[PDB]
Design a protein around this ligand. Structure first.
Ligand SMILES: [Zn+2]
Ligand SMILES: [Zn+2]
Lengths: 91, 89
């Protein structure tokens, strides 16, 4: 299967560090918006071997690399918090 | 709900030019390699609404832009052909 390994990384960081990103709404819509803003800000890393995504995801341990990504998510989270899409929860 | 629109463009362009790229193997595995190498050389364009990906397939039918992307396809095609993944055959 054809998949950008950065999307796997983000989705993982987003789920693990959801609370420290301080989102106004946590519905799937708002979450997808954060992901999209963030994935459009990192260089694509498409692969075809699931074993290869495992290697990438492992390289971004709790120590070292993940912080730069958490910062982009947080930043994107701010934007979605203030300017939510019309497809989000309403009333 | 979460797709890179470039992915929708490259797939549509590949299955319109695949038989012109002089690819060594044309199995799904090598096709994925081509798409992956190509997707990695263009800027991501992630979307969340379904209304964009539908019309995105129409404004890619327009040219000049896809020409730049065709080149990419072809350049990706040469690499995959020259060095096929061991998941192919
Ligand atoms: Zn929401
Ligand atoms: Zn092949």
């Amino acid at each position: 299967m054809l998949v950008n390994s950065k999307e796997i990384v983000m989705k993982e960081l987003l789920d693990r560090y959801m609370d420290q990103l301080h989102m106004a709404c946590t519905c799937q819509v708002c979450q997808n918006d954060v992901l999209a803003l963030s994935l459009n800000k990192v260089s694509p890393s498409y692969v075809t071997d699931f074993k290869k995504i495992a290697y990438t995801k492992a390289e971004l341990v709790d120590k070292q690399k993940n912080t730069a990504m958490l910062v982009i998510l947080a930043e994107s989270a701010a934007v979605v918090s203030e300017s939510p899409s019309d497809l989000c929860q309403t009333k």
